[PDB]
Design a protein around this ligand. Sequence first.
Ligand code: CA
Ligand code: CA
Lengths: 901, 881
Amino acid sequence: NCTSSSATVHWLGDKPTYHAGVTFGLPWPQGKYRPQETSFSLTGDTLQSWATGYWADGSLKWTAHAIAESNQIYDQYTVTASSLGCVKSSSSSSESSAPNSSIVVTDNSDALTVNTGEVAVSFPKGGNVIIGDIKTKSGKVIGANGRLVLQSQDSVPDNFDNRANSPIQYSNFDGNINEVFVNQTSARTLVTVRGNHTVTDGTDHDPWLPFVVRFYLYANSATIKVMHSIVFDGDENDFITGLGIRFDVPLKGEEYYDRHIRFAGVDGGIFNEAVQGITGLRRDPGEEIRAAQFAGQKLADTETWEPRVSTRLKWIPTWADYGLTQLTADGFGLKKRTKAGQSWVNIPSGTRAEGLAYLGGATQGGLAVGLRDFWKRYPVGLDISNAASDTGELTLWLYSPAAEPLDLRPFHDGLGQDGYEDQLDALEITYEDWEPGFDTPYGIARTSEVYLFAFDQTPTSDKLASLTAYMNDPPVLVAEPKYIHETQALGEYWALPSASPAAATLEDRLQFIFDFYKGQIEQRRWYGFLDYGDFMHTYDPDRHTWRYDVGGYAWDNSELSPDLFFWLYFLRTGSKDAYRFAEALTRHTGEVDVYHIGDWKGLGTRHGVQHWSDSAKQARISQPQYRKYFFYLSGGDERVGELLEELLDTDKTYGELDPQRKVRTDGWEPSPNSTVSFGLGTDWSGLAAGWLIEWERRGPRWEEAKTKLTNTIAGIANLTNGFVTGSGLYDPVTWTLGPPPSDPGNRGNVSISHLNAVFGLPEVVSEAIAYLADDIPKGFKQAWLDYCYYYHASASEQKDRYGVSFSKISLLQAHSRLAAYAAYETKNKTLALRAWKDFYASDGLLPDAPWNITHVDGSDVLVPVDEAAWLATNDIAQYGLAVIQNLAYVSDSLDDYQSLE
Amino acid sequence: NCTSSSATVHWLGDKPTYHAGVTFGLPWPQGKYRPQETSFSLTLQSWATGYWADGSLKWTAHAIAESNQIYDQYTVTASSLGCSIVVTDNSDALTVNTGEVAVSFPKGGNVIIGDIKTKSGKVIGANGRLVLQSQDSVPDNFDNRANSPIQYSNFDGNINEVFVNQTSARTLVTVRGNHTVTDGTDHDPWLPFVVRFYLYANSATIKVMHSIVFDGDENDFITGLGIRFDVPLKGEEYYDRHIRFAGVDGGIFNEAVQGITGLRRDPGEEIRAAQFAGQKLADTETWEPRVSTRLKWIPTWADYGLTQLTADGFGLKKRTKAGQSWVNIPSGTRAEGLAYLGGATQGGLAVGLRDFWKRYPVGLDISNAASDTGELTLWLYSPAAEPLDLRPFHDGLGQDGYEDQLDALEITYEDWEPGFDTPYGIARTSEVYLFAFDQTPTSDKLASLTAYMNDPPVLVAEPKYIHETQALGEYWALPGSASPAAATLEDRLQFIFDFYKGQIEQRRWYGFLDYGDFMHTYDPDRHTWRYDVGGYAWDNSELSPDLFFWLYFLRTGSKDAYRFAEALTRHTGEVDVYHIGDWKGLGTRHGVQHWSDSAKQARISQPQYRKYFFYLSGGDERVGELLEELLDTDKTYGELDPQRKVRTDGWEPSPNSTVSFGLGTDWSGLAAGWLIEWERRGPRWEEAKTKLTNTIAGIANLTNGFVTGSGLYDPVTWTLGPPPSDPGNRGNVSISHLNAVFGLPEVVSEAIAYLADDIPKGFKQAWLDYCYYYHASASEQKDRYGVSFSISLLQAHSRLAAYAAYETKNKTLALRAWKDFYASDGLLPDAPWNITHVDGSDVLVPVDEAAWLATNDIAQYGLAVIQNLAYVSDSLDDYQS
Ligand SMILES: [Ca+2]
Ligand SMILES: [Ca+2]
């Protein structure tokens, strides 16, 4: 019979003044709603839907929803779910109403056309043009031949002087379409276009730099959201110099004085000009003619002016090109010229441009284009070309050619390092684990969030400033935290913020950590095309800088799961700032810090001076768990969907590359057609998170992932030392897990690492135990409980059980949460107290650490900066997770712990 | 018998923390002191810079050594008659030795500083060389670079002449030359240069005036311009080699070639703190051995580069060596543009550019710091920037001949012509500083030296004294108000100053060539100054802003005021004037580019504009040089007619043939130039004296005086006769509003006073008549001259009435001067007299505006206030009636 329930959803911060349609996710409790048998309705104070994840029983876990662009914006949106037996025992009569707007698509051998009711855009199925043309509802074309432009060069001169004696061969490229896909729905439609960049001008060069561009169009919207994603293919010789998206804007028929150029400036500023300026001449055509051009309206017929002006328009210059370059994160330049062959006139410019340009006119219409977080991702640009011609160009440079070309080559030569002993010895001084030919960016990726806007006529500047604001803070709808928690669709291991004054200062200290790391991004200028979203790993208290030049201490690359902390922090709080911080991080770490092709497809690169410089290529960085939260909140963002699917191939890498090669003291080395060795902590937490997720989404490979997950859970269980076992051997035909090389026949092996639990293990393990339910392999849960308990048992408790004590245990604050979990699962108050003692005593960040920032200025530093010095990113990340998880599992013990002193 | 007096001299603003030797100037009264006989003491190195008519001292200049002891004031006593650096000559190169540093300058070759030694004898840097890179075309757009590759060419500075003005306290080394190719496509020598090195006793800072004259084709695009040194560091260990960069507002960046801080293992807290402080690291045996072994594994960083390519942002980066990627370094907004390379034991050098970010694109490179020899490079124009493109900004838009050209002038206020859109012969001067160090200095010192170069302390006379000597005109006085009406005038002058000082920042009027100028008229609809409409963009000294801002300094003493007037003069005197070629000595009319207009005219180069700075600086040798160039201005009147377009007449110019001079518009700029050389007693002073006195008597023996609009000048006889509209001199009347507003009243007042009793009969009266009759009734202008006029900038010209009022003791005239001031054109007293702030989506960035004014109005408003107060401030109380 009938089952129905509601969940509410809220704007991430303040209520928007404009949105362009929006997708959101909603969790649902285990077993409540069958797929295909569940309708969903929208209440806005007074619904397009689909599934993104499922429970082990097959019921709905997460769904995504989509609402059209709308004048009417509410403070909150309430979805109601209804089982199908809810309307198949009804005897009432609903009106079936038509939506006021609804998407339609036409299909053809040549092209694919999506009509929202405000625009219609065509997507060629082949060739060197992504978007064929863009029409308003009028029918008129406002822009056309959207194409991807790449430019490269085959070498770099040693320095500026070397230019005269070092030839650079420049080469241009076009986006070649290979595949076009579609997700049609009435409320929004997603066109996914995969491709390749191919030569146009300059030297013949294999096609390269694969792409996939996603176009989101919503009913009733003239706004297209564009998720441009490129994987890097090149080698020592392919230096990128220009990367961008370009449109023709047809202006023929428009008087020059009716053609309009707008660039977004600083803080909701807009730059307002026309191709032929009528304002500030020696003579005046009339107050209202001038006001009108400034406003972007069609100017009165020539006959009504003062004739002093109309007769001499042949002598007023005519500005064909405009250029805006943002080459540092703190200043941009702006210039125009009359045409090629003449010098540019410099325009008064400023600090940080919000990254939108418009080209068009009062009659012919036109389009605006922009990049989200424009200046934060320098070097970038905005070009207008040939605006005094029949067809204008409008270009967004994701990488400005006015910048130095993008050099991805190694930052050093090896410093003489010959083989592992030397490499390991460098590790001891710089924390860098170098290896020859491993400092490579081959396979890394980056996504960019572009927006397109179509106009029937030049819009007001206020509209342009609004769309600019919009683009840079795209409205998000999210589930209430309390509801996400009750559903348990996203972990047992966190809960909301208790009366303990101890607990209250913990919350303050998580806020402190967050406020600090948010501010540092600005202060240390962790900005730029590849860099933005990451932060650094450790500080230099002498120089007052993050150790950007000392091997492993530089870019943090998700070391010790800061990604879990900041996402868990967002879940618990619903803070806008927190989501944005984690959004940015997840777009960096998932794209730039992991390999998407090549022999290492599915491994990421350990923390280093470059995001790819270190040899340790491991699954703990690619760690799918770090993406799960943002995948599901957000309505199954299809890019991350793809990234998660890519990771299913990670097990294949342990045949090509063993992460322990340099330290493994057994015989082992991978060989062909043969069981492969990986870790049970670091490596297996990566593998399992990915398998769990494929199973959850019921994607192409879900059975397989279910098998690999369940068999390895059984293999660890059957290993007589469980996780404490060093870490075993995996068969890539049978999908099973045996004991390691140093112990065939499972007699008992012991290898402990402070790193095994801190890259997702407890989080994946808890979800896996929860998902598998009654089908869980016998005594796997005991083995996990074992690891959790013996890790900071006494040395004699360890020797008793496993044969030897664990001398090299550290990160005791970090592992406090493993006791906390065990304390909850066994209902043991003493084990609970141990979690808190390890949290508050032991290591990491102690409660009596400074817990403040120092300001540093004058001649000590380049710029004024705030600093810790007493903390490092490893510290805060595990602290943060310790606070959250110990509070989830054992808050009932915290005042008890506190009252004993 | 003794004549003795004292004059005191004060810092510009606050007492400086540090100076590196200073030259200042003092005026003296007409007839007080003879040149070789007068001696000067302090509480002193001295020379004459200008003189009065009878040969007595007018302006002196003085130098003091660098001193740890610094005073609030310095008092110079002069007494009438009846009352340390070491230079050495090898047959090869010359060394100046201040006591603290010792610099060798070759007399030829492509190296300009041979070596720099500290007082111990250690060579801290060597091979000072001028550097230049160019390219031969630019692409149309970025896509065009595949199909149109381009020929780069490196050059360096070849020396031709070297001069030495040597004195005990100060020693100026001048080095002329040009840029002579090395690597890249063959190319003739070009880009003539001059580098003046000032060295003072007991200083290791060297001030460096690097001037350049652009003399290339449409095909010469400059991609890089700079000064470069070698820094030795052979003995020094990688972790004892230190790199600094000035950052933002007191900031310094502090690294080392091989860093020992931030490592996985600590060598020692004391060690780590020492590298950070630029000290020699204790013996490696005293380190933690986990760090001292394994030093091999810590990378060395040879190459550092700071690029400042906008006024609001710099990037900073580091590289192990070539063939590896750079690593980006946390950076910021506006770097103050000093770099240091050197070591704890081997010593080093710092270079920088005054006003660095304000003159973008600039850069600082350090290179090969992990090698036997390092390179340290100031880039006055940075390679990381787009090439410097001085070609014209339009193609002519199909203008053909003077009828079209004057038809465009009516809508865009631009007078174009083909071939006149040319930067050939413009110049630019950069103020660079070198600093020599026996060992890596403290970061605190580096910051102090950075602070110093960006605000070089200046020593100036008291305003009461300057005015009292009358050695810079009688046409201004100190503020000290008596009426509330005068007080409001003062407050309005600060309003004008604060607003313009503001707009430089707000409208980013910065850059290599731009910084120092401002713009002409405002577009009130776009809320932008009119940067893109012909003659409404860069002001290029129109209506004598330079006169207003310099006179505003004289009156007040304001540091801000001097600094503004200075930056202006460094622009207008250099990039707005031509220094070589056929137009040498003329400047370009206000435009979109500084050189785009076809009206090349002496009203713009007007030597009066540079006179106040020339003396107050203590004889700035570069402004001195520029003032000599302007003595050739007359030659151009046989090579270009300013009226070639506005002529229903047939006339044309040839060399040594007679020409028409407008008596304000052409003659006052020439008289200015001639009056200055006579005052200085320069190489052409006899020439100058006769050209001035001839033409001054010329104008007196015209029947109608200045009222006769113009004259006819013989280049052969150096004399001035009636205009071709009235040979035989029965009488002419021609009046232009343009004649008084470009320094005419200033030159005439000064000349009358200069000549004294040797003034030609009836010159002063011919002037008073212009001053009286310009805006008298047409009943008073027919009743003499027989043909009543047809008066157009009454506020501006109110000054003239006031001069005549002072001189005639005529209270009717003074009140008319105040009526014309307060109640006609220009800035009326009822005008808004406030700013409007503008933001949101109307503009790119937020701005304050005053659309009710334009630069022409403030320039002439400011002169009228200053001048009317000086001459007729008694008559101001009475005008309130
Ligand atoms: Ca990274
Ligand atoms: Ca100028």
